[PDB]
């Protein structure tokens, strides 16, 4: 879970300061993300780290019927 | 937009940031379209208190996985 993202990250050869530069993110937030805090990350941090990672952060909201994306 | 979907679901901003027990400047700033800012936990609360659920995924490829 925090596991999946350490994995991606040291498959790629990056250090959490790598990340961290690439992202233009505290280390400090890479650490806790990767610790499983997920829950306290801003939206614009976490999609910055996941895009360090080569990913694609999707935000959606189911509401009934509905999913939106944000 | 949020606003719209609070809105159509008849809840004020007082309402949701009560029912969210969160600060309502923070509601304040999710629903003016800054996403950015808000926390995960935080964004979690309000879309509940809008009686939705929240999906954050990571997509590298076809691959997929949720992160909350």
Same mark, same amino acid.
């Given at each position: 879970?925090? #596991?999946?993202?350490?994995?991606?990250?040291?498959?790629?050869?990056?250090?959490?300061?790598?990340?961290?530069?690439?992202?233009? +993110?505290?280390?400090?937030?890479?650490?806790? +993300?990767?610790?499983?805090? +997920?829950?306290?990350?801003?939206?614009?941090?976490?999609?910055?780290?996941?895009?360090?990672?080569?990913?694609?952060?999707? +935000?959606?909201?189911?509401?009934?019927?509905?999913? #939106?994306?944000?």
């Amino acid at each position: 879970r925090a #596991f999946r993202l350490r994995e991606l990250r040291a498959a790629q050869s990056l250090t959490q300061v790598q990340v961290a530069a690439l992202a233009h +993110i505290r280390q400090s937030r890479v650490s806790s +993300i990767e610790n499983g805090d +997920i829950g306290s990350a801003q939206v614009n941090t976490l999609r910055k780290y996941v895009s360090a990672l080569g990913g694609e952060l999707d +935000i959606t909201v189911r509401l009934g019927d509905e999913t #939106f994306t944000l």
